Design a protein around this ligand. Structure first.
Ligand SMILES: Cc1cc2nc3c(=O)[nH]c(=O)nc-3n(C[C@H](O)[C@H](O)[C@H](O)COP(=O)(O)OP(=O)(O)OC[C@H]3O[C@@H](n4cnc5c(N)ncnc54)[C@H](O)[C@@H]3O)c2cc1C
Length: 456
DNA sequence: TCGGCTTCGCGCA
DNA sequence: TGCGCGAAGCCGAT
């Protein structure tokens, strides 16, 4: 569909039909940004070919009642900034509330849209809304992978067992798909308040806030400023100040040496392709660059591959056969400790390291990358069953992580609990052959006491 | 039918 | 601290 700097492999047709005479509508769900957005760029070019304006629509669903205020404010503040950025390019933004299967279909008929475009997400609920929209529209419907450097349907046609199988396929396609982003051309043709939605949502989630003993909320919202502009600053400071030491200190939670890009990446407020562009371009430690690129290319996009080809990505069924057989045989093993969801949530276990990790999660909304494994694996060790462990880890992850409700989270938990994209290890009690992590193992890798003292 | 697996623990300089 | 081995099942190159 036209374009010179436009790889057609990034766009797939969800529904064919006659192209209407109205504006092209970009249904934005996952990539909430104005710059470095292939889905937004693809909508602009098609609208340019038909001599029609492009508009962006966002549907606020009821799914924010399952998470907390920390994610709601972070997303809403970014949308307010994105609304002004799109208005400067004469691109109006419409914010709907309700079921997208009904609101998008009503919007497309009322505004007489000619072409519908949306970004890609392998999550189950996104596919359900797509199927409802297809059944309610008669105009072409397109889907664009704006989140991965290589389109998810292009990197692999099947579920990938391990990184070492998926790595050569991704890197082989890098010279074709790693490219600079063209500038978003403003519209040539012009034709609910987010403040009220922010106020209404906060009041609804206020009773379910995470409070302390003296009725003070735990969340500290000054650690990550939301928005597309603030995402850019985080990327710059990582390359200038932290990228050099990333390879050596990525597994040290006492050192702030991570990129801290996961909140922005999850909400689409910054493009991982843009980050990869800047990282590939910087002169830094070759070991550190390879260590970071593997996280943001291999492990990030293989989490999409996992969720896209495994509809039960959040269930015990998706675990590899050796893992399911191992965990099943140890179901009757006596657990040293058994904690409920409430006890896990409040950090009331016998392990100060686990409790400290939970307190980082509650107070900052971003647990360090290394402790997230120890956190999830100890949940498996101190729960009734593998099923109860999975649901507890998923519940706590999505409720308190800024980057939660994400394919990285589900693949990250499946790695820790079911050994997905992992291999078998020493046979043990309760965890079977799943990779084991111990408190003493953390002690020899970083100052555990400093991490504990930082979070009580 | 071998080689080597994100990210393990553990003994040893 | 950094290094090498152990423990374990399997994909993918042939
Ligand atoms: C049990 C568990 C749960 C997790 N929960 C989430 C989650 O809810 N959401 C989320 O985005 N990630 C999650 N992670 C993956 C990873 O820990 C985070 O991406 C990382 O901690 C975010 O911090 P960072 O961006 O500063 O890390 P960096 O080291 O700077 O990572 C750079 C980027 O690479 C990607 N990445 C890094 N590590 C991984 C990984 N292990 N798997 C996949 N992609 C990765 C992310 O996009 C990340 O932003 C989880 C991992 C585990 C083991």
């Amino acid at each position: 569909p036209r374009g010179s700097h436009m790889n057609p492999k990034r766009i797939r047709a969800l529904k064919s039909g006659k192209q209407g005479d109205g504006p092209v509508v970009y249904w934005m769900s996952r990539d909430q940004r104005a710059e470095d957005n292939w889905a937004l760029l693809f909508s602009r070019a098609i609208a340019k070919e038909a001599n029609v304006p492009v508009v962006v629509v966002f549907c606020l669903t009821d799914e924010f009642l399952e998470a907390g205020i920390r994610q709601y404010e972070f997303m809403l503040k970014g949308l307010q900034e994105l609304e002004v950025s799109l208005s400067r390019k004469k691109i109006p933004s419409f914010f709907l509330r309700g079921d997208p299967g009904e609101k998008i279909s009503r919007f497309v008929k009322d505004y007489n849209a000619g072409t519908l475009v949306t970004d890609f997400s392998p999550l189950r609920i996104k596919n359900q809304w797509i199927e409802k929209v297809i059944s309610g529209i008669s105009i072409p419907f397109f889907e664009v992978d704006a989140h991965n450097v290589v389109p998810c349907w292009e990197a692999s046609q099947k579920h990938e067992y391990a990184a070492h199988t998926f790595r050569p396929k991704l890197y082989a396609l890098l010279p074709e798909f790693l490219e600079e982003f063209p500038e978003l051309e403003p519209n040539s043709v012009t034709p609910e308040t987010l403040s009220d939605v922010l106020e209404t949502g906060v009041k609804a989630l206020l009773p379910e806030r995470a409070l302390l003993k003296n009725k003070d909320p735990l969340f500290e919202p000054w650690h990550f400023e939301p928005g597309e502009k603030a995402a850019k600053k985080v990327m710059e400071s990582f390359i200038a100040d932290r990228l050099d030491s990333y390879g050596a200190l990525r597994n040290d939670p006492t050192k702030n040496m991570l990129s801290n890009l996961s909140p922005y990446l999850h909400f689409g407020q910054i493009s991982s392709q843009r980050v990869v562009l800047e990282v590939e371009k910087a002169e830094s430690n070759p070991g550190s660059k390879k260590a970071f690129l593997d996280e943001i290319l291999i492990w990030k996009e293989i989490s999409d591959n996992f969720c896209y080809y495994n509809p039960g990505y959040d269930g015990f069924e998706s675990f590899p056969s050796w893992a399911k057989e191992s965990l099943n045989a140890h179901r009757n093993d006596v657990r040293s400790h058994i904690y409920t969801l409430e006890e896990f949530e409040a950090g009331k276990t016998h392990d100060p390291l686990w409790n400290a990790s939970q307190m980082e999660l509650l107070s900052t909304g971003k647990m360090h990358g290394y402790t997230r494994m120890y956190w999830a694996k100890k949940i498996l060790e101190w729960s009734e069953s593998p099923e109860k462990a999975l649901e507890i880890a998923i519940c706590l992850n999505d409720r308190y992580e800024l980057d939660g409700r994400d394919p990285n989270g589900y693949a990250g938990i499946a790695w820790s609990i079911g050994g997905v994209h992992d291999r078998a290890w020493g046979e043990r009690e309760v965890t079977g052959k799943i990779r084991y992590m111990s408190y003493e193992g953390c002690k020899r890798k970083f100052d555990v006491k400093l991490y504990i003292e930082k979070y009580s």
